[PDB]
Symmetry: C4
Subunit: 243 residues, 4 copies
């Protein structure tokens, strides 16, 4: 049997949809899973994990997602802390597997806290609160981090979802540019292409129920108990819409 015959016969082999469907499932893309981040954090962090998480989130907010490159520009007291978190939590950088932790992932899993901390550390964010104020005045700090996306309640009146997203998008434009100078001249449709996929994924994620997300938005002052967004959020949405 020549190689040719072998290849021809193979084209006549069964193509069973049922068996293949199962394989696709095994091979399926496994995305971000906040539940697994929380698992890893709890297992590795022991009893003091919550305090560790807050430290790691403040770390992420002010210094980004590369914990080793971070050490090359840090006081020696800070390094004792960061090296200790790295070891305890086996911290990685960039985009590894489902059993690895990153500052970004941790910040995302605990978004509701991340976004309150951003208000506190606003003067030390890649894009600053004041920097945003210049674009839209009194810009809501709770919006100023990518993890906010996971706090959006999509069952809200469509007009309101739209105002919240658009206001966050305005921040994401400055942010995405600041993190990738390759975009600082790109078009607005282009910059938005660089974050809208994972943004939509978090908006429509099954982690945190609609009610849960809504309750957090009310605590942040983003919407009142009557579902009406802050003037400050509508304002920023206007500026975004004058694209």
């Amino acid at each position: 049997m020549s190689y040719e015959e072998i290849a021809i016969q193979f084209a006549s082999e069964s193509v069973d949809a049922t068996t293949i469907a199962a394989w696709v499932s095994e091979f399926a893309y496994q995305g971000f899973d906040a539940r697994q981040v929380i698992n890893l954090v709890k297992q590795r962090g022991g009893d003091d994990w919550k305090e560790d998480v807050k430290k790691m989130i403040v770390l992420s907010l002010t210094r980004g997602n590369k914990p080793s490159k971070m050490l090359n520009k840090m006081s020696e007291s800070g390094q004792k802390i960061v090296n200790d978190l790295i070891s305890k939590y086996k911290l990685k950088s960039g985009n590894p597997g489902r059993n690895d932790l990153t500052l970004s992932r941790i910040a995302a899993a605990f978004a509701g806290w991340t976004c309150q901390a951003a208000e506190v550390v606003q003067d030390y964010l890649p894009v600053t609160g004041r920097a945003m104020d210049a674009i839209s005045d009194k810009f809501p700090r709770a919006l100023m981090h990518p993890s906010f996306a996971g706090l959006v309640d999509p069952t809200l009146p469509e007009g309101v979802v739209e105002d919240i997203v658009h206001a966050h998008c305005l921040f994401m434009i400055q942010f995405s540019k600041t993190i990738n100078p390759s975009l600082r001249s790109s078009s607005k449709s282009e910059v938005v292409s660089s974050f809208d996929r994972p943004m939509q994924a978090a908006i429509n994620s099954p982690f945190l129920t609609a009610g849960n997300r809504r309750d957090i938005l009310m605590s942040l002052g983003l919407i009142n108990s009557n579902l009406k967004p802050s003037p400050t959020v509508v304002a920023a949405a206007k500026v975004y819409r004058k694209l």
Copy 2:
């Protein structure tokens, strides 16, 4: 004898065409060889190789050609399977030598099967069947993978070859863009430059005789027994030609 003299004399050394021709042959570029892929698969895979090949091809269709980067976004049950294929077949990524296997190579060697499987896993392809439907309606799924090129019978009436290629090119445009975002704004002549060399190589490859390729195209419903392409294939060729 100075270095100068040595270099001058060397310019007077023999330039024998016969001896050099042989050297060029030894040094010649050895391209893709489906026969050698089949060899390696058979040797390494033992008796269950065919089932393994199908698994590897479904893997390629849905997750691409980097099997290790693939593990970082896969369920744990899938990883047992993929790690096992990697070990058994010594799977590599990208473009290694003539004694190495890759998902892409395997998918290419068994193109006739690859292209039927793409119809089954169409909703999980980089560019989806429905996505193509928007560009040209009822777009033939059998075309939707680069390995299809090797199934083209070039001895067919030129008009028909042209319709089949052009229809496949329309898919290759979406595909090539989806795999390289650096092209998502490039011109159509530019995108096509990114795949037409290896495409032509497979169209004019001596692996699978004209009759063999033709027989597979008839099985796929791409042409009838009278050598006339599906309306659906002519349709897509029109859309490609309005470039």
Copy 3:
């Protein structure tokens, strides 16, 4: 307690500004510190450190900041010297931590000397003295190195600071282009973006008092004792301003 509940409760955890402020401090960005370069140089260099520093600075001026890539295009006598400096001072390349030395850092810490040496080795600089003469005649060599920025006295009459900076910027344009060919076609606002951040940082750095910087500028002949810049410096500032 589900992962959901855990994440919700965590959003209600304390956000104490005082404790967080301290963390930001620990995690704060630690920039270039000339004092620490001098420390490392003194510790590692022993008694002959000053001569070593001069050698390392002449090295930087003529061959750049990558000491290993440098060895691949150096006489064998030079390599004995460079390998010896590398070992003694544990020389690194690019941008490492606060306990590492680089030619660039050393050249910057000792800017007042660096800029006199540039006058001596002007024909062997990336951008040459004569090359600058073509742009603005008799261009002041003391300006022709990035470390000059740290010698600027910002308490000077604003008009004078402006002339000194602008004249240095004209050099920095040629320099920045020569070091990054990716800019050789870029706009002038774009090239300037590639050096003005660290330039401003050194102009407004607390290392070297205003009086100290001013005294060095007078020694270099850049300003007279009456605070009036060289004609040659005003000249170059004009050319820069016709951007």
Copy 4:
């Protein structure tokens, strides 16, 4: 003594021109040196070195300057030869130090032979003889390799040097594009920028006297004994000049 004082005093340290000049010499850029390539080849190659050099040059002409990446697309008989040359001559790729050999360097050191071989292996060159024929008919194959630059006698009548260079430049345009697709759309002044520095260096190199270079050009049929270039070379120079 504060760090400040130490830095101020250091600015008053001697700047002796004589001592510094010597350092610049030690640190000077050491470029390509054909004499040293010939040395390394002779030492490492033993008695059969000339045959080895010819093999290595035919290798360079048809497969480029990366000998390991080369093995991934080579017959198994060729690999026995190439691996043997690699070991014997300690072959490297890209741009290493003065004690390392590369196919490119070897081809350059023996340019007079390299350029005759290119005539023999013309159908297997990155840019082919026929490909050049389309641009300028009967294009002189002896020009079709970068090493040719070292064969130019610059003491020739300026008009003739100009015709020879320009004709070679036309090849270098196709070549430089073929090797760097990043240029396949670039302007002609831009492409030429990518090879004219080392080209000029070889034209004005002190390796091979004017008389030596001239004698080789006559052997190649590029000029007659009366210093008049082939019609075919003037022709190609015209096409280059219609830039």
